[PDB]
Amino acid sequence: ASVIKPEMKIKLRMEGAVNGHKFVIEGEGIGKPYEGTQTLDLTVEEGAPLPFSYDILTPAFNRAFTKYPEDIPDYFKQAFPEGYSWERSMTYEDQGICIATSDITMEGDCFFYEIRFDGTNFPPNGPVMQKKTLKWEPSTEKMYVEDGVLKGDVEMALLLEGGGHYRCDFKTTYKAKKDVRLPDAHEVDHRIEILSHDKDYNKVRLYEHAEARYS
Amino acid sequence: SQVQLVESGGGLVQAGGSLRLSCAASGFPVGRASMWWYRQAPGKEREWVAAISSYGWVTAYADSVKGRFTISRDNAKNTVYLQMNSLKPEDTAVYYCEVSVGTGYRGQGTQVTVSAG
Ligand code: NA
Ligand code: NA
């Protein structure tokens, strides 16, 4: 038996601020780590209504939920039960910038995330502060090892109202609490989607599908 | 209000010179908030300069300073360093740091003046 069950629940709390607006979001959900699928129900507990596009937050809301082929070592599942943390810089094409940190632990059949999210320098009339984003496009994150830890780069793109795209570069460092078998360079294909939401995004249901592969 | 922020290292340097700023925070748990550099010149509005994550694993820079400035952080203290190389007159300003975003906690700043020539 692995400590990572075929079905794992999720509980999380995010505290953060975007362009000075503070907020707290809590989440509950469930997913299938070996299928690479998960669903989360998120609730704005402080700072409602959010004055910025909810989409900039959603990738901060766990690479344990990735379908890993057997010939690629799975850094994330191996990291449990002790867990792992990641930090991420998100640099937007209009020089908006976000930095997030998340600590991921486990108890029983449930992951626990504590997430800190800070963003600023977004133009007040840009698509983030004016809530003109529609969705993230599906993406491909390039995973590589450097300094003995696992890192990932992905070029991201938000579809805008009117058909434009608004671009972002993600740089992530992932660090397990213990030493684990490190993989070779590979890729992770992602698809993240807000399945439903209420008017102001105080309630959001969020889905990701993710799968690792070599080339 | 044991929370305090103190920037050090500013000064008068000539164009093409170097300075190493630092920003020391007290009153917070070590390495559990991101830290952010800003600067503000005479009649100009405040500019974001650089940022570093809680644990120091990731960094970010404004386009105007990328490749010239480097941000780093003590793993055991809330102390951040901004190595400023290849300085330009446009870099003249008061530089300050903030813990996290939107906290209201700000330091007095440190004056950087870059003399042309
Ligand atoms: Na989204
Ligand atoms: Na969306």
Author numbering:
A (entry chain A): 2 to 62, 66 to 219
B (entry chain B): 0 to 116
Verbatim from the authors:
For further characterization, we obtained crystals of TGP-Sb44 which diffracted to 2.0 Å at the synchrotron. The asymmetric unit contained two TGP-Sb44 heterodimers, which were highly similar (Cα root mean square deviation of 0.29 Å). The Cα root mean square deviation between the previous TGP-alone structure (PDB 4TZA58) and the Sb44-bound form was 0.20 Å. Thus, the binding did not cause noticeable conformation change of TGP, reflecting the ultrastability and thus structure rigidity of TGP. Sb44 binds to one side of the TGP barrel with the surfaces showing electrostatic complementarity. As typically observed for nanobodies, all three CDRs were involved in the recognition of the epitope consisting of TGP residues from the β-strand 2, 4, 5, 6, and 9, which are 3-dimensionally close but primarily distant. Similar to the GFP enhancer nanobody, several scaffold (non-CDR) residues of Sb44 also participated in the binding. In detail, the interaction was mediated by two salt bridges, nine hydrogen bonds, and a rich network of hydrophobic interactions made of apolar residues and the hydrocarbon part of several hydrophilic side chains. Peculiarly, six of the nine hydrogen bonds involved backbone amino and carbonyl groups. Interestingly, the other major interaction surfaces for protomers in the previous structure was exploited by Sb44 for binding.
In this work, the authors demonstrate that a coral thermostable GFP (TGP) is an improved tag compared to conventional GFPs. In addition to reporting melting point stability at temperatures near 90 °C, its fusion also helps increase expression levels of test membrane proteins. High-affinity synthetic nanobodies (sybodies) against TGP have been generated using ribosome and phage display, enabling purification of a membrane protein to comparable purity (~90%) with that from immobilized metal affinity chromatography. The binding mode of one of the sybodies to TGP has been revealed in detail by X-ray crystallography.
